[PDB]
Amino acid sequence: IVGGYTCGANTVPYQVSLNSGYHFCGGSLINSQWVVSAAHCYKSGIQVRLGEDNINVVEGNEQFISASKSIVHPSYNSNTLNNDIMLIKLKSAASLNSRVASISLPTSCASAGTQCLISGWGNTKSSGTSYPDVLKCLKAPILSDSSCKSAYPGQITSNMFCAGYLEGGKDSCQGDSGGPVVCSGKLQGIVSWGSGCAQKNKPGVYTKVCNYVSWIKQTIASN
Ligand SMILES: O[C@@H]1[C@@H](O)[C@@H](O)OC[C@H]1O
Ligand SMILES: O[C@@H]1[C@@H](O)[C@H](O)OC[C@H]1O
Ligand SMILES: [Ca+2]
């Protein structure tokens, strides 16, 4: 998160950390045993770290669960990042309380203009490198399909939307991938890609979760 703020410990209770010896992606808890993430975040040996604020300190509320199975979207294209969504099944059910909670899947797509919560442990600087130990939060509106398609010609599919600010200075960034974009209490986006971070006329590009509620729900009822 570039240009955001310190969320506060456990105030984003659906935010997870993907850990393979080190934080490498975010993810979003949607029920006690399933995390949704970015498909380009896929790797073998994933442990899912719930209840995290400082990812380099044990603080009192963590749950560490190994993945038992990962499902990259059947149609994920790593070249275009089209359909950048993946589901992770947890080996044991997380124990749900006020600091470890699932976030509701949409019944509707969020409209251009709607302001959302983007959170992650990604790089906080746009020209330079610096990674936080605590979770960082950004409120960013959704942007119109017509300025999204302009900012990134030939690259925006119906499976993506842009969210952010075209004057730059505020974005998600490397290390935020897999993580939530929440609007009106609905996991609407998944941190996916962009050109740099916090750059003018280059807003964050997010996987459009509402296209995948049918794929998510029928996957989760059969696995
Ligand atoms: O974003 C672009 C992607 O859509 C694809 O075309 O590969 C090149 C990238 O610049
Ligand atoms: O039991 C685990 C604890 O030992 C570890 O410190 O962090 C995750 C917990 O689930
Ligand atoms: Ca911790």
UniProtKB/Swiss-Prot annotation:
GO terms for cellular component: extracellular space; serine protease inhibitor complex. The keyword Hydrolase applies. It holds the Pfam family Trypsin. Synthesized in the acinar cells of the pancreas. Binds 1 Ca(2+) ion per subunit. One of its GO terms (biological process) is proteolysis. Its cofactor is Ca(2+). Disulfide bonds join C7-C137, C25-C41, C109-C210, C116-C183, C148-C162, C173-C197. Substrate binds at D171, S172, Q174, G175, S177. The active site is at H40 (charge relay system), D84 (charge relay system), S177 (charge relay system). Interacts with SERPINA1. Belongs to the peptidase S1 family. This is Serine protease 1. It comes from Bos taurus (Bovine). The gene is PRSS1.
